[PDB]
Design a binder for this molecule. Structure first.
Ligand SMILES: C=C(S)[C@H](NC(=O)CCC[C@H](N)C(=O)O)C(=O)O[C@@H](C(=O)O)[C@H](C)CO
Ligand SMILES: [Fe+2]
Length: 329
């Protein structure tokens, strides 16, 4: 038997309030989760998640081939040399099932200082035609700030969990410079389902996406109700159960690094399932020059010998490595 992962449901609503003790009781749950399998579900979170899977379907269903080339990232369209991160990631019928749309900080405009300096990892979002996709851009931009809001709360929790003041992470997570991204991913139902789009793990499990750690501080994910994720433990992979009312939370490799691996970046993978579904991650990245001084919660003096890492450099290296390891998405 494949076993099932312990993924506690955590009411995060106090992290939005001023009851300091209640916040500590949340911090404690985040602590325990982070030291166990690495994942928890954030519940009672305040986001209208019914209004987000709805909009995402429509978009992926009604967007045409013409429009997808017009929006395509550099990997699909050589005319779009500036689109490395933001835009459309096409499927390849017969070969690749998955398709997606990535967007960045909406404050990234032509006269944003980092765009004018052409700093790596910063791009101006591309959007579909407003008449073919009415209200889509307004929706997506508002969603970014809703999820931004939630993540800030979560960070206050991770800060207190590690014995820090509640702004230790959050002070670096700002609307004006955050490198955070949203990805709207469609996993289609297909019949017949293409063999090239299915990978076989060392243990025989059929996968849509291979094992990895996330390139992030934390990952804040909504998914529709189809079980697919697995987390690696010493006893092997365990199933993460679906919950399409909550957010699935985990640490990325920036956290592992900062905490001297006290809070690991859990290794996980995506099982193949032939079912129509949505996966909407928000990757919680800091600013290009944000630096957190590493530390070691296991040591009485808290000291770590690890070098401080600037976030933009970590992010560039990480995104290139993911593609070289798990493929162009
Ligand atoms: C390694 C991960 S978490 C994948 N992420 C990327 O490929 C990075 C996207 C970065 C974005 N283009 C940007 O520029 O920020 C990803 O989102 O896939 C999710 C999924 O397959 O549902 C995931 C694998 C579930 O674990
Ligand atoms: Fe991941």
């Amino acid at each position: 038997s494949v076993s099932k992962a312990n993924v506690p449901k955590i009411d995060v609503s106090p992290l939005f309030g001023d009851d300091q003790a209640a916040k500590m009781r949340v911090a404690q749950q985040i602590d325990a989760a982070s030291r166990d399998t690495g994942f928890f579900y954030a519940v009672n979170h305040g986001i209208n998640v019914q209004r987000l899977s709805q909009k995402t379907k429509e978009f992926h269903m009604s967007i045409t081939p013409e429009e997808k080339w017009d929006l395509a990232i550099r990997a699909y369209n050589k005319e779009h040399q500036d689109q490395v991160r933001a835009g459309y990631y096409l499927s390849i019928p017969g070969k690749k099932a998955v398709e997606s749309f990535c967007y960045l900080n909406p404050n990234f405009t032509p006269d944003h200082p980092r765009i004018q300096a052409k700093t790596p990892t910063h791009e101006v979002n591309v959007w579909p035609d407003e008449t073919k996709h009415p209200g889509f851009q307004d929706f997506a931009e508002q969603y970014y700030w809703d999820v931004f809001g939630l993540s800030s709360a979560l960070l206050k929790g991770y800060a207190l969990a590690l014995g820090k003041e509640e702004n230790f992470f959050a002070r670096h997570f700002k609307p004006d410079d955050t490198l955070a991204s949203v990805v709207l991913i469609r996993y289609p139902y297909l019949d017949p389902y293409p063999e090239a789009a299915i990978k076989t793990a060392a243990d025989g499990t059929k996968l849509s996406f291979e094992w990895h750690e996330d390139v992030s501080l934390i990952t804040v994910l909504y998914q529709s109700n189809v079980q697919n994720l697995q987390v690696e433990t010493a006893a092997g992979y365990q199933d993460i159960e679906a919950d399409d009312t909550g957010y699935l939370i985990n640490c990325g490799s920036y956290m592992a690094h900062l905490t001297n691996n006290y809070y690991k970046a859990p290794i996980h993978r995506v099982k193949w399932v032939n079912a129509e579904r949505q996966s909407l991650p928000f990757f919680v990245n800091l600013g290009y020059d944000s630096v957190i001084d590493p530390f070691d919660p296991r040591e009485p003096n808290g000291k770590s010998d690890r070098e401080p890492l600037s976030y933009g450099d970590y992010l560039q290296n990480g995104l290139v490595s993911l593609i070289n390891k798990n493929g162009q998405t």
